Design an enzyme around this catalytic site. Sequence first.
Site, short mmCIF file in Angstrom:
data_model
loop_
_atom_site.label_atom_id
_atom_site.label_comp_id
_atom_site.label_asym_id
_atom_site.label_seq_id
_atom_site.Cartn_x
_atom_site.Cartn_y
_atom_site.Cartn_z
N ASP A 113 -12.62 5.67 3.38
CA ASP A 113 -11.02 5.66 3.66
C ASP A 113 -10.59 6.99 4.05
OD1 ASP A 113 -8.51 5.31 3.61
OD2 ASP A 113 -8.44 4.65 1.35
N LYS A 130 2.94 11.51 -3.72
CA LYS A 130 1.91 10.82 -4.20
C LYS A 130 0.85 11.94 -4.88
CE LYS A 130 -1.69 7.38 -3.46
NZ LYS A 130 -2.11 6.45 -2.43
N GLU A 154 -6.91 0.65 -4.44
CA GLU A 154 -7.07 0.68 -3.00
C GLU A 154 -8.50 0.24 -2.64
OE1 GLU A 154 -5.60 4.64 -1.72
OE2 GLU A 154 -3.53 4.05 -2.90
N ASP A 177 0.86 -1.31 0.17
CA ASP A 177 0.19 0.01 0.02
C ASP A 177 0.93 1.19 -0.02
OD1 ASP A 177 -1.84 2.15 0.61
OD2 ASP A 177 -2.13 1.56 2.71
#
Length: 385
Positions: A199, A71, A175, A10
């Site tokens: 999330d 990211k 994800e 991850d």
Amino acid sequence: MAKAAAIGIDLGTTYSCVGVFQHGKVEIIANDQGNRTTPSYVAFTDTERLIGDAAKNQVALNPQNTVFDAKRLIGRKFGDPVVQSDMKHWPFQVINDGDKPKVQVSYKGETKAFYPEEISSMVLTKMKEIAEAYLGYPVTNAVITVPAYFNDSQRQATKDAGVIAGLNVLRIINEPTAAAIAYGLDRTGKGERNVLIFDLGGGTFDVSILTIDDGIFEVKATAGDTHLGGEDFDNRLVNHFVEEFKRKHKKDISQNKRAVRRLRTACERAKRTLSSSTQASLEIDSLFEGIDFYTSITRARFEELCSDLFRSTLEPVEKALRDAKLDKAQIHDLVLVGGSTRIPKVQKLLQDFFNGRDLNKSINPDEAVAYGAAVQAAILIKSTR
Ligand SMILES: Nc1ncnc2c1nc(Cl)n2[C@@H]1O[C@H](CO)[C@@H](O)[C@H]1O
């Protein structure tokens, strides 16, 4: 041996996690400091390059050469309004190399510049070495996860980060898909299954709705806030304690960078304690001008301080449901991802919104994505033989 082994990674905005599926179970691998998640930070110093915990631990002393949030840049053009907006908030320099952003730092006394995929490759190399130290042999096959809204350019740059890191990228998976795999939601036989993934991480909030029809995944909707996470809750605690210090001592600490950072890390810790206790204690020796700051806070006060932020998480849930053209009673499963979903008030708000429904939360929410990626990496490497 090594060729029949695969890891699940991850690669998160603020933290990364690595797992391995072996002997019928997923093992989330602890790093050399015993932590099951590793900060997505890379520090460039006068003698070395630091990755993870050691990089996060010296961020105060070296903010210009400590890179994080790669990211947010990966797979994007320099001119992208997301890049232009984010750059104003980072202490490191972002430069333009033919419409491609590069992070520019000082390393061993020299000016160096890195592509976001080169920064992410250093985080991936660390996760690869953490797996290798645990396993006793080098593992090179990996499944790497990305948000469900990443386009082709962001997915390709993530795969490139994997290649630079020396990993054979078996697949780039979403994800929320990895999270649904972690809970075995694709193995319920026939008939379409609607899954909502909630999330809430350290710096981002994502809501995803998936349909699982006979093992086949389909993304129905994605919603959220790219600038809402656990760190906003730490900052609400910081503002409270700055005001409490002012009431007790008639001194403003807000301008003292060292005092604010020490209070921030203590607030993050107290916030975590508040997820399993109804009170937490702050114990800061000589916070400002030799004054110790020994105080406490209830979970009730913390919930009041973040009340508006917790409630704002339900607007992207409603938005995702309308985009997916689904009502609440049409959602079969609710999955929690991200460390901030451990907050009891957040669970209560989501459960009440879904009319008292049970939540899937038995897997450490900050580990569920790596868990699923590890399961997928095992299935994929077995099919390769
Ligand atoms: N027990 C907890 N109670 C509240 N927040 C938590 C908890 N654990 C983590 Cl990690 N976080 C936060 O999750 C993020 C990483 O996913 C960070 O913001 C961390 O503070």
